[PDB]
Amino acid sequence: STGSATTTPIDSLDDAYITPVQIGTPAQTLNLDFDTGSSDLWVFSSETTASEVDGQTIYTPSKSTTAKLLSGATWSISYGDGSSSSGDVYTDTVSVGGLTVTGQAVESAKKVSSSFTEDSTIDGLLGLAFSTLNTVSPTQQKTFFDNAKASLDSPVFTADLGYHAPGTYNFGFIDTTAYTGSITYTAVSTKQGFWEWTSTGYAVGSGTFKSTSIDGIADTGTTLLYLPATVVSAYWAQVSGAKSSSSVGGYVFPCSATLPSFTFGVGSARIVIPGDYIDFGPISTGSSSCFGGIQSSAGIGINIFGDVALKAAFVVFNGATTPTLGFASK
Numbered sequence: 001s002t003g004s005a006t007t008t009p010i011d012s013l014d015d016a017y018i019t020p021v022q023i024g025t026p027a028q029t030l031n032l033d034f035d036t037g038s039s040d041l042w043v044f045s046s047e048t049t050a051s052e053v054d055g056q057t058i059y060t061p062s063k064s065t066t067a068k069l070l071s072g073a074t075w076s077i078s079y080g081d082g083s084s085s086s087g088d089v090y091t092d093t094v095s096v097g098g099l100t101v102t103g104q105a106v107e108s109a110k111k112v113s114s115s116f117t118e119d120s121t122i123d124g125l126l127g128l129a130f131s132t133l134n135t136v137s138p139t140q141q142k143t144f145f146d147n148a149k150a151s152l153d154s155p156v157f158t159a160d161l162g163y164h165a166p167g168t169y170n171f172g173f174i175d176t177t178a179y180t181g182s183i184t185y186t187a188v189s190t191k192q193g194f195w196e197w198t199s200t201g202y203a204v205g206s207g208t209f210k211s212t213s214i215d216g217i218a219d220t221g222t223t224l225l226y227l228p229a230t231v232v233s234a235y236w237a238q239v240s241g242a243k244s245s246s247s248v249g250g251y252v253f254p255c256s257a258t259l260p261s262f263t264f265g266v267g268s269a270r271i272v273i274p275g276d277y278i279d280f281g282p283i284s285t286g287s288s289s290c291f292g293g294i295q296s297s298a299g300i301g302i303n304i305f306g307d308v309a310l311k312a313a314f315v316v317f318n319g320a321t322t323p324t325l326g327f328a329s330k
């Protein structure tokens with residue numbers, strides 16, 4: 001089997017991407033944030049604290065004839081941005097663009113943190129990292145990809161995020177028309193539960209490529225590109241007026257700037273992120289100071305190849321016996 005669904009940026013800045021997901025019987029369509037940096041499929045629901053829902057579409061398990069309460073199961077998760085959610089669990093039929101999983105754990109939110117409430121465009125998350133990170137207790141649950149894997153024509157999913165435009169998530173196949181050149185595969189470590197790999201280096205604009213190992217994760221659920229301070233300082237030193245602002249929480253630059261590109265290495269291959277992809281607009285409404293899309297990972301503990309990097313490439317998340325990651329230009 002295969003699945004194919006369009007992913008859409010939630011706003012004019014590509015702050016996140018939403019993909020419609022069908023849950024239950026009859027189908028209840030919710031727009032979820034496909035996240036390769038987490039492993040829980042959770043949704044806003046009829047059980048979510050009333051004051052914590054503000055415009056989101058909710059899943060109502062009592063209206064689904066295939067929903068079953070997973071007895072005694074609870075979940076609680078915290079993300080890198082300080083956000084969190086928790087609640088109870090149902091098993092139900094979940095479909096993504098024609099691909100169906102019966103008995104998928106659907107984590108119903110009883111509580112969500114302010115950032116989730118404040119974002120009316122995201123109805124929940126669909127985790128695509130390794131099932132070892134799943135927070136369901138006392139019986140850990142599998143991801144949608146992990147449940148569908150054996151049924152897929154090929155044990156893979158692909159992320160093709162658009163810049164200011166819709167893109168696609170495919171399951172079970174590689175669309176050879178969606179990229180240019182060839183796909184370069186690179187080794188993955190699953191020890192931390194992430195699609196963790198090692199970039200072979202970088203370049204800033206038309207500058208010389210620096211061969212240096214950068215361990216990091218391919219994460220569709222993180223908006224920006226988080227890299228070591230030395231690399232990020234080399235990037236922003238090419239932009240007149242750019243500086244690290246402690247009050248803003250990162251590198252800012254004059255909105256009047258035309259940004260240079262950023263290249264990252266995948267083996268001997270090179271992925272070029274165009275400069276416009278690194279512009280995240282005014283720091284506050286009407287400001288002429290803009291927020292940078294490449295930020296330091298110094299406070300995180302890990303480098304993150306978020307949407308800024310992934311949207312420049314066609315990315316293969318290969319769930320073969322030994323998982324690997326594939327990157328191609330597009």
Ligand SMILES: Nc1ccc(F)cn1
Binds near residue numbers: 083125
């Ligand atoms: N880096 C993040 C932040 C929030 C979220 F829901 C997922 N990933």
